[PDB]
């Protein structure tokens with residue numbers, strides 16, 4: 129993911145491309161903060177293409193809609209031509225990069241938070257590689273910066289700290305008396321005690337800290353390019369709301385004709401899916417039935433800004449409808465402040481004994497762009513959803529959806545995952561927001577789409593602990 133330059137300007141981007149690149153060279157950078165710019169070289173000139181993400185997907189101007197920036201780049205490199213990634217040397221979005229950090233502070237961190245193989249890189253004008261080894265000690269390796277090249281006092285001179293770190297991860301530096309300086313995993317600084325979330329939110333709100341943590345998580349997306357072949361099949365093309373936002377094959381819900389754009393999320397399980405299309409309503413009810421799901425979480429209006437986000441897949445109040453082999457009666461609608469509850473009865477046509485109640489929780493007040501200013505409404509809604517799921521003996525995974533089923537869906541599921549760890553293990557437990565997002569993202573592409581949702585997840589977890 130070296131093509132992503134987090135701290136450069138358009139002018140700097142143009143100079144890089146016209147001097148260090150050729151025609152077909154490109155890079156992506158953050159813009160209007162929240163937006164992104166694909167800066168490409170074509171015929172000795174630079175084109176700047178806009179990428180928008182209000183929380184649902186990456187929308188490339190003159191292109192398609194994508195689950196991740198890595199996925200957008202992989203597509204255009206396998207299909208203006210995107211030929212040569214212009215590499216970034218800047219290590220700010222690296223998990224191990226701590227910058228302004230002292231030898232005592234680094235030793236504190238490796239001693240408490242660290243285990244064997246834990247390492248970090250901190251900053252005169254030179255850098256330090258601090259490693260923990262044992263079962264233990266901490267070793268400090270000097271990193272000379274000479275003419276914008278990095279070295280450990282001898283051997284190879286690297287173009288960036290990244291190339292240095294990667295090199296010494298594969299071939300570890302061996303101390304004269306046997307000890308191999310293994311770089312096994314970055315120091316896990318994002319793992320915190322739940323009860324101290326407020327202190328971390330304060331530090332993250334300083335000069336922002338939330339932007340560095342999120343982009344460091346975004347940098348790990350290139351490790352999640354799992355196959356999405358079933359979704360690409362000719363027979364399955366129009367079963368997708370967005371042609372390029374597909375389910376991973378290894379986690380997709382298989383229907384026992386077997387396709388739905390949905391994925392099982394294992395942290396109580398979830399099904400992360402898209403908003404129904406006219407032609408997938410019957411596939412949605414087959415899935416709910418088969419999975420034995422008793423709760424559905426809808427986090428979108430049917431129509432937002434004049435565009436259909438999800439078709440009406442449920443009958444009107446008191447009405448009975450058949451959707452293929454599946455039968456649904458809307459028993460009762462209950463309208464709360466932020467949401468509407470719909471009590472549905474699902475059964476197989478021709479089998480009276482298969483009947484079960486499906487509680488549909490429709491959140492109706494989420495803003496068209498961005499996230500709610502306060503998490504109270506979302507938390508209260510999640511609490512009710514949790515209590516319903518809990519009261520139902522042997523219930524299947526909770527179905528969660530919005531439009532593409534990755535942004536608002538991912539956000540709701542992750543909050544639910546974190547507030548659940550707290551429920552079980554109590555206020556004195558460890559929680560790691562990006563480790564949780566990364567674990568959910570390996571089960572469905574681009575789960576949690578923006579920095580605004582990322583910050584909202586932190587605000588949600590903080591507000592839950594405050595009222596505990």
Ligand SMILES: Cc1ccc(-c2cc(C(=O)O)c3c(-c4ccc(Br)cc4)n[nH]c3n2)cc1
Nearest residue numbers: 223225226316317318341344345562563566
């Ligand atoms: C100065 C400074 C600021 C922020 C960080 C930092 C550290 C980590 C980390 O590895 O603990 C991560 C992560 C993360 C965590 C686990 C997994 Br699996 C995937 C991503 N995401 N964002 C992060 N930011 C480090 C130094």
